[PDB]
Each structure stands twice: as C-alpha cells, then as structure tokens.
Design a protein around this ligand. Structure first.
Ligand SMILES: OCc1cc(-c2ccccc2)on1
Ligand SMILES: OCc1cc(-c2ccccc2)on1
Ligand SMILES: OCc1cc(-c2ccccc2)on1
Lengths: 140, 144
C-alpha cells in the first residue's frame, strides 16, 4: 500500500496538469507542464521519487509512459510501472481558486495546498498530508 | 529545532540557479532549478513546498528575491513566517558533490539535481543502523 501511487493527466487552458495520488492517503503532488512529453513525465517521476518512497506507479496507456527516458528514470529510481474522487476534487478546487491568481500553475499549487491540508471529518479527523506521513512512519 | 522550520539557500552551477529548501531537524531537502532568483519564482517554490510538507517558518538569506511583495503575499497565504537573515552550508557543498557523481548520466543539469536530491534523501547517515533524512523527516512530522 505505502509505496503505491496513481498518475493521471488533466487538460485545462491549453496545458496539461500531471497529478500523482498516493493511493492509501489521498495526498497529491501536481505540476503544470506545457505538453505531456516522455521527458516531462520522466522528470516528474524522478522529482516525486526523491521526495517520497515510490515503489509502484499506476498510469494510463499513454505513449509518454513507455518512452526510453521514462524507462531509464524508472530503472534508476527503482519504480515499477503498471496500468478520480481526489482528481475531480482537485479540478473543482482549481475552479474555486482559479480566479485568485494570474497563472494556472499558481492556482494549481494553491489547490494542492488546500487538498493536502484539509481535515477530513470532524474533530478526530486527519488531512491527507497527515495520513501519508503516519502511513510511512508506521511502516518504518 | 521545531518540525516546521526550513532553511532556504541558493546555489549557482553552470550559469543556472538551484533553489534548495532544507528541513533543519532532519537534513531532508527539496531543490529545483529556476531560471532566475525573481520574487515570482521564489514565491512559487515556497507555495509548492508548503503544499507538500507543513512549513511554519522559513529562514532565508535576506536576498532581494525575498523582499518581493509576491513572496510576502505567498507566506501570508500559506501561514508561513519568514525570518530573513536569521541563521547546511556544507549542504550546498554536499549537493554539488553528489551532482558530480550523477552529472554524466543526465543530458540536462535539472535532471542531475533531482537525481542528487534522491541520493541525498535516501542515504543512510550514521552507518548501517542509522536512518536517512527521509526516514527522519516523517518520524519527526508524524502526529499519529
Ligand atoms: O501526521 C503529521 C502531519 C503531517 C502534515 C502534513 C501536512 C501537509 C502536507 C504533508 C504533511 O501535518 N501534520
Ligand atoms: O508569482 C508566482 C506565485 C504567486 C504566489 C502567491 C500565492 C499565494 C498568495 C499570493 C501569491 O505563489 N506563486
Ligand atoms: O525506509 C522507508 C522510508 C523511506 C522514506 C523516504 C522519505 C522521503 C524521501 C526518501 C525516502 O521514509 N521512510
């Protein structure tokens, strides 16, 4: 469970949002990139893997994920590759704040901040951020 | 050191800028190549970082990029207190060593920096019974 992520793209305003969801926690990382390239994908994956303990990524069938640069990055970083609730949610927060910023990429990271900090449930609840650190700390 | 305290520093290599955030208690790092130390680039780095880990305070070098109104606006929004000029120099030293060990596997410097971040955060310190910066940050931050 703790090493598993799902990666998805979302299309808005002529660019691509790459979104990686930590499956057990709902925690997200996201980045706006100009186009969905093998290179951009590979880079997003190395960044994520130096930050969190990434064992497996679950992706769509896209040609970006089967590129030699993506395969080189996965081999080096130790990532096995394979083939919405949190993601429609992200798109909705983007809308709730998109107004508040000049560029989309600013509203996107504002949305990540909001998602990852938000307590789910009542008093006794946890944010997605809290849940991922607890999951990984427990594992260790 | 609080679990919420970060130190930001910059390094220049090959004519490019590397912004580095160090989690002071653990030695964990986040780093990115940016085009130039502008307010808008520094603000965006901080917004990203604060969205990923619980950032309470940032100690900075008091560079002109931090005096930017946009950086203050970002810290305010994210609930970060900015402490300028308030003192890991062997960190910017450390990252450049590791960047040299991987530089030949990467066509572009920015890729080599993420590779170095990865090696840094996974490295066991203190010998075979020790722990990585990555292990230490989650242990320090975990509330339950
Ligand atoms: O369980 C400890 C904890 C984790 C966080 C956190 C908040 C936001 C992003 C990542 C982690 O806050 N408290
Ligand atoms: O200019 C890029 C940018 C701006 C911000 C910002 C975030 C929150 C409030 C105000 C400004 O973050 N990155
Ligand atoms: O040893 C398991 C483990 C790995 C990590 C980690 C966290 C952040 C970056 C790199 C590694 O945390 N717990």
């Amino acid at each position: 469970s703790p090493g598993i992520w799902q990666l998805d793209c979302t299309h808005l305003e002529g660019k691509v949002i790459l979104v990686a969801v930590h499956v057990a926690s709902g925690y997200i990382e996201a980045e706006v990139i100009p186009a969905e390239t093998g290179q951009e994908t590979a880079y997003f994956l190395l960044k994520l893997a130096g930050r969190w303990p990434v064992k497996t990524v679950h992706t769509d069938n896209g040609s970006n994920f089967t590129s030699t640069t993506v395969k080189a990055a996965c081999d080096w970083a130790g990532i096995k590759q394979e083939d919405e609730s949190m993601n429609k949610e992200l798109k909705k927060i983007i809308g709730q704040v998109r107004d508040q910023a000049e560029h989309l990429k600013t509203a996107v990271q504002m949305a990540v901040f909001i998602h990852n900090h938000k307590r789910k449930g009542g008093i006794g609840g946890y944010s997605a951020g809290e849940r991922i650190v607890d999951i990984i700390a427990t594992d260790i």
